[PDB]
Each structure stands twice: as C-alpha cells, then as structure tokens.
C-alpha cells in the first residue's frame, strides 16, 4: 500500500564552504581572512511532478540540519558550525513514507583541520622514530621562510619525535619607529607594511601570507583548498598527532621591537585581544609563545629597552593567561602560555620569573648564541653546558644560566633547555696558544650556509665526514667544534654528544626538557639525541 514521494534529485551548486574564509589572492591580512562563526550551506533539489506541500529535511551524515516543505523543486539554506566532510542528503516525506536523494559529499572547511586528511610523514634522513614516553618537553622551531630556498615544508618535520612545535615568527603591526629592526633585512619591513595595511598597529599579523596560507604544498595544491601554505599543513599535522602542541611564536630577534611599547597599557590590551582573535581564527594553534628579545633591551634595537620591562613582561603574562582562560571557557580546550627567554644572567636579572611563572606552562631557555662572529676577539662555545677549562669564570653557559634562573625561585619543571641545530663560526683564526683555537683572534665570519657566520648542522656533519674538518670535543665544557688549521676556520655547534649530555642534565636536575632551533638545519642526528637523551622510547 505504501507510496512515498518521488526520489529528490539534487541540483548543482557549491559543494565546499568555509567557516573561516581565506582570500587566496590577498596581500593584506585584513583582506586575507574573515572569521565567521558558522558556514553557510545551500542545496537545491528537484522532483518532477511532486507535491510542494510534502515535508523536506536536509541531513548531514544522517543528522537533521534543516526542516521545511520543499516538495517539488525546493531549496534550503542553513548554518553549519563544525567543519568536516559531510554526506548531504535531501529527504522528502508524505503520509505514506519518505524518500532520500542520493548522497552528495560537501566540504565544510575550518582551521582546526576538520575537513582535511592527516598530514602523513616518513622519517627522513637520519631521523629514527620515537615514542614520547618520557613526559619531557621535546620542542623544535619551524621557520616561515623555510619553504623558500631551504626547501623545508611542514611535511619534512619528523612529528613522531616532538611534543611541541613552535612556529616562527608571528609579527606585530608597526611602521616607522615600531618595527625598525626589520629594516636591516631587505624587503621585510616593506613586506610587513603590505601585510598590515589598514590594520591597527600593535595587533598581530602574518609576515608572509603567501608562505603561510597561499603557497601550494604537498596535499594542498588544488585550486580551492581553503587553506594552503604553512597553516594548511599544520592543520593536517594536528590531525596525525592530535596531542602535538603547535604554538605561534610572536617576536624573535627582528620582530621584538613592538613589545617595548607595552608600557602603554592601551596598546598591550589591543595586542592581547588580537591574539585572542588570532587563536579563534586559527584553531590549530594551542596557545601562545612570547619571544620578546629582550625585556630591558640589548636586542636588535640599540635605542629600545628599559628596567621597567621586567614588570611589563609579567603583566603581559598575566593578561595573556587571563585571555586564554576565557578562551577556554568558550571553546572547552586547554591552552599553553610559554616564552623564549635569554640565557644570559644579565638579561634574566631584568625579569622576576618567579612572578611570571604561575601564568606559564614552559620557559624555552635560549641556551645558545653565547658566542658568535659578531666578535673577532671573543671566541668560545656557543651553547656549551659548562665553562671551558681555559676559562672557568665564564658566565655564558647552560649551567650558569639555569642555576641563575632557578636562584630566582623558578620551579625546575618549567625550564626547557635549548639545543643548537646550527654552528656559529669564524675564519682566519690566528695567534692562538696551546693548540687551542679559541685563545686567538678571527678576521671575520666563517662562510655560512644561508647567512654568514652560521652553518646548518647537516652541513657540518656532512663535511666532517668528507674529512674537511678537524673534530674536537671539549669534555669539560661538553661542546664540540671543528677547526681547519689551514684557513683558520673555527665553528661552534651542538652535536649528538653534547645534546645527550644536555639530556642527562635536564633529567638529573628535573628540568622540563629540551627544544631546538631550528628544525630544518638538522639531519636527524640531534633530534635523535634529544629523544634518546630525555629517556624516550625507540
Ligand atoms: N651579543 C649580541 C648577539 O646576541 C647578537 O646576535 C643575535 O643573537 C640572537 C640570540 O637569540 C639571535 O637570535 C636567535 O636566533 C635566530 C636567528 O639566528 C633568531 O631569529 C630571528 O627572527 C626573525 C623573524 O623575522 C628572523 O627574520 C627572518 O630572517 C630571514 C633571514 O635568514 C629572512 O629571510 C628573508 O625571507 C624573505 C621571505 O620571507 C626572502 O624573500 C623571499 O625570497 C624567496 C626566494 O625563493 C622568494 O621566493 C620570495 O618571494 C621572497 N619573499 C628574503 O630574500 C630573505 N632575506 C626572513 O624573511 C625573516 N623573516 C631573523 O632572521 C632572525 N634574526 C631568534 O630570534 C633567536 N632564537 C640573533 O639572530 C643574533 N643576531 C648580535 C647581532 O649580530 O649582536 C651582539 O651584540
Ligand atoms: C674583524 O676584523 C676584520 C678585519 O680586521 C674587520 O673588517 C675590516 O673593517 C675595516 C673597517 O673599515 C675595513 O677597513 C676592512 O676592509 C675590513 N676587513 C678587511 C678584511 O680588510 C671586521 O670589522 C672585524 N669584525 C668585528 C666584529 O670586529
Ligand atoms: C687579539 O685581540 C686582542 C684585542 O685587544 C689583542 O689584545 C690581542 O693581543 C690579540 N691577540 C693576538 C694573538 O693577536
């Protein structure tokens, strides 16, 4: 006896939608992104000779999203708040029974990666897979510019082997006076201004929208993937490892300048609000990393810095945490507040980290760049654990900084020790005593991989193997270095031996773990060492 309505046939229209719209052709951030709180779906259907007064429903994965009459040649529009891949069906009803259209798939995109398959990886180069068993922090920085000459997109990141991924860097909008430090690097200040065009200063932006959201990378080349570039892959990343913490790092050396204006409480509040907006917009992020270099000055800008920064650093941490607290209220998620701080005691002394730590999850202790080509007559270890035998009252070492930091009353668990995946070096090192090249003087920077005076560990590791270097290991300082007595070339770096030693130090002293700058300069050796040295499972 049953005679349901005719089978609805879905008309043609849009099949992909986005809760957060991204303009694939925008240079400015304000034109690049619009966050909506829901997407907006439309479906057309048609039944030749039907009863328009029948009942109609639109079902996304067998759940109701709309309800009306439709009947014969109908139409519906409704709002979807959570992204994913949905099977869409139109259902017709009369007094006998119901009819279901054939399913059509739709993509509702959103920035927590819901619409995306998991970013998958293969261990590359010397990486060996580990399990994060130790409960220790194992972090690494990923630079935005890595996708250009460096050829290191997100998919080359060995994500079984990390607990934290720091994205460097996120800028703060500012022109002349605000962000002058960017001018030492050609194109970059200008690149920022184009990005922040029409944007209030002291809000956060994206330094390179192309790299971040528009560049095609593996898995996202199709002409309408809502999100491509770096952010796109990072979304797929949280989908392979939902527990891997991905933090946006704000500042760094050449972007830290706006922080010195946060003495102005009005500007600070705008900033914190913009970070809140940033996280609601880019949901794959898990909180905030602050990289102000440095509170009190002595960073890129020789004209910026005040003792009054130590107190600002703590109020920024208080207000940021409070923002994340109400961000958690609305989203039910947990967020991390972290920060990268100097390992020099004279910069540490500026801030009361015992005062700030109650707001923070972790402190990434920049225990590298202790020495470099910025000096011809202060040669030494760039990232050593202890002072060298030929200079016992050396204050710029991992150990000294950590002890100094703890002495403020910081809880050892929050301190995450830094490891260098790069070398700093010199050339023309002459006039040294006792076959120790550090007692002499250089005539300039070593020849660098990308930049002068800096060398990727992969480059160093490979050339040591071609016999192009004299390898030595300071067993007292716990740091390696290569030397070339001919040309007078000298390079300080971290290798797997010093890195395992930092691991043993972290564990002996009940520290938080290790992190590395920067992930692309490693061949796998060092991250293997970090994991093997913190007690993780192979
Ligand atoms: N005693 C002090 C010394 O301490 C001091 O030395 C300083 O010590 C600190 C210690 O903390 C060092 O800082 C640490 O290490 C890293 C760097 O080593 C720090 O990172 C900083 O952050 C900023 C973020 O903006 C970095 O900016 C980026 O720098 C790169 C250059 O490598 C730029 O490259 C340019 O990229 C653009 C595009 O993005 C390129 O243009 C593109 O070209 C491609 C080609 O294919 C094309 O397709 C594209 O269309 C086009 N867009 C352009 O050609 C590149 N030049 C990035 O753009 C730029 N964002 C910055 O590098 C880095 N400094 C980190 O904070 C910290 N962990 C200090 O670095 C060190 N200076 C010394 C100072 O010498 O003084 C003593 O007194
Ligand atoms: C390291 O030493 C080199 C060479 O002594 C310095 O470079 C020279 O700087 C002077 C300054 O006018 C120039 O006349 C020379 O041409 C430069 N180099 C050479 C090879 O002649 C360099 O400035 C020193 N670096 C630091 C950080 O002190
Ligand atoms: C290295 O440079 C310092 C700078 O003052 C100088 O005093 C010293 O004599 C130099 N050493 C050699 C071996 O040239």
TrEMBL record:
Gene3D superfamilies: 3.10.50.10, Glycosidases (3.20.20.80), Immunoglobulins (2.60.40.10). Glycans are attached at residues 376, 441. InterPro entries: Chitinase_II/V-like_cat, Chitinase_insertion_sf, ChitinaseA_N, GH, Glyco_hydro18_cat, Glyco_hydro_18_chit_AS, Glycosyl_Hydrlase_18, Ig-like_fold. Residues 136-537 form the GH18 domain. GO terms for molecular function: chitin binding; chitinase activity. SMART domains: Glyco_18 (SM00636). It comes from the Eukaryota. GO terms for biological process: carbohydrate metabolic process; chitin catabolic process. Pfam families: ChitinaseA_N, Glyco_hydro_18. Belongs to the glycosyl hydrolase 18 family. Chitinase class II subfamily. PANTHER family: CHITINASE, CHITINASE 12-RELATED. This is Chitinase. It comes from Ostrinia furnacalis (Asian corn borer). The lineage of its organism: Eukaryota, Metazoa, Ecdysozoa, Arthropoda, Hexapoda.
């Amino acid at each position: 006896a049953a005679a349901p309505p005719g089978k609805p046939s879905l008309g043609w229209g849009e099949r992909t939608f986005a809760i957060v719209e991204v303009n694939q052709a925008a240079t400015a951030y304000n034109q690049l992104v619009t966050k909506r709180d829901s997407a907006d779906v439309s479906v057309t259907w048609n039944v030749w000779s039907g009863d328009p007064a029948d009942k109609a429903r639109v079902l996304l994965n067998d759940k109701e999203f709309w309800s009306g009459t439709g009947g014969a040649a109908g139409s519906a529009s409704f709002k979807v708040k959570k992204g994913g891949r949905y099977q869409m069906v139109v259902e017709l009803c009369n007094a006998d029974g119901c009819s279901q259209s054939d399913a059509t798939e739709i993509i509702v995109a959103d920035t927590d990666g819901s619409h995306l398959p998991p970013l998958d990886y293969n261990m590359g180069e010397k990486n060996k897979p580990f399990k994060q068993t130790s409960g220790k922090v194992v972090g690494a920085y990923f630079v935005e510019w890595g996708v250009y000459p460096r050829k290191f997109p997100v998919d080359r990141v060995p994500i079984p082997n990390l607990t934290h991924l720091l994205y460097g860097f996120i800028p703060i909008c500012g022109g002349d006076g605000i962000n002058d430090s960017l001018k030492e690097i050609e194109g970059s200040f200008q690149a920022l201004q184009r990005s922040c065009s029409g944007r209030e200063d002291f809000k956060v932006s994206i330094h390179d929208p192309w790299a971040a959201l528009q560049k095609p990378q593996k898995g996202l080349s199709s002409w309408n993937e809502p999100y491509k570039g770096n952010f796109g892959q990072l979304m797929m990343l949280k989908q392979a490892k939902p527990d891997l913490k991905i933090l946006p790092s704000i500042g760094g050396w050449t972007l830290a300048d706006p922080f010195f204006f946060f003495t102005d409480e009005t500007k600070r509040r705008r900033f914190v609000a913009s970070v809140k907006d940033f996280l609601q917009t880019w949901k794959f992020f898990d909180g905030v990393d602050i990289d102000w270099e440095f509170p009190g000055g002595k960073g890129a800008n020789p004209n910026l810095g005040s003792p009054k920064d130590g107190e600002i650093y703590v109020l920024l941490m208080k207000e940021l945490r409070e923002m994340l607290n109400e961000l958690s209220a609305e989203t039910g998620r947990k967020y991390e507040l972290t920060s990268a701080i100097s390992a020099g005691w004279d910069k540490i002394q500026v801030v009361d980290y015992s005062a700030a730590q109650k707001y923070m999850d972790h402190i990434f202790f920049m225990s590298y760049d202790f020495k470099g080509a910025w000096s011809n007559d202060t040669l030494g270890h760039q990232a050593s654990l202890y002072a060298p035998d030929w200079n016992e009252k050396e204050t710029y070492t991992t150990d000294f900084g950590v002890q100094f930091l703890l002495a403020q009353g910081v809880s050892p668990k929050k301190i995450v020790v830094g490891v260098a995946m790069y070398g700093r070096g010199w050339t023309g090192v002459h006039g040294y005593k006792d076959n120790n090249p550090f007692t002499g003087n250089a005539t300039g920077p070593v020849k660098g991989t990308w930049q002068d005076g800096v060398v990727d560990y992969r480059e160093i590791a490979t050339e040591i193997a071609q016999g192009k270097w004299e390898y030595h290991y300071d067993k007292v300082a716990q740091a390696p270095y290569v030397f070339r007595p001919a040309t007078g070339d000298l390079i300080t770096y971290d290798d797997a031996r010093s890195t395992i030693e930092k691991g043993k130090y972290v564990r002996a002293n009940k520290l938080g773990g290790l992190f590395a700058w920067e992930i692309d300069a490693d061949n796998g050796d060092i991250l293997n060492a970090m994991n093997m040295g913190l007690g993780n499972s192979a």
